Design brief:
- Chain B: Component of the MAJIN-TERB1-TERB2 complex, composed of MAJIN, TERB1 and TERB2.
- Chain B: This is Telomere repeats-binding bouquet formation protein 2.
- Chain B: It comes from Homo sapiens (Human).
- The structure holds 2 protein chains of 2 kinds.
- By secondary structure, chain A is an alpha+beta fold.
- Chain A has 1 helix and 6 strands.
- Classes of the chains: A alpha+beta, B mainly beta.
- Strand 5 of chain A pairs antiparallel with strand 3 of chain B.
């Protein structure tokens, strides 16, 4: 169902094309089964942030607590993104998702 | 005390792709002030 799988243990930076926009996502996992269940869960996490851009709060998934954060994207004017001929519009904020286990 | 369930969080329901430059027609460009 989902798009590309995640580095589970380690930090990663993911660019995402959604509507006419490019989102910069950074994922961090703290003190930490079935690959695509986790993929779908982190994707669901992204979609949630993407649907609450100005209304960020920590949430609980099946396995995790996601604390999304939003920082200015420094030097975005320096970058152009294209999908073939189509200009993609950068959302000029970095989303950092800090993912902990619920326990 | 307790965090909101993802189930109660509204979410973006659209097509969503990894922007991977050099893939699926995707290209990224960095401003320069020198040329070669």
């Amino acid at each position: 169902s989902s798009l590309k799988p995640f580095t589970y243990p380690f930090p990663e930076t993911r660019f995402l094309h959604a509507g006419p926009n490019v989102y910069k996502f950074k994922i961090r996992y703290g003190k930490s089964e079935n690959k695509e269940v986790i993929t779908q869960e982190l994707e669901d996490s992204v979609r949630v942030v993407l649907g609450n851009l100005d209304n960020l709060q920590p949430f609980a998934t099946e396995h995790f607590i996601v604390f999304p954060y939003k920082s200015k994207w420094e030097r975005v004017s320096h970058l152009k993104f294209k999908h073939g001929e189509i200009i993609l519009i950068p959302y000029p904020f970095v989303f950092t998702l800090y993912v902990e286990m619920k326990w | 005390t307790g965090y909101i369930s993802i189930d109660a969080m509204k979410k973006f329901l659209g097509e969503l792709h990894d922007f991977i430059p050099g893939t699926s027609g995707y290209l990224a460009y960095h401003v320069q002030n020198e040329i070669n």
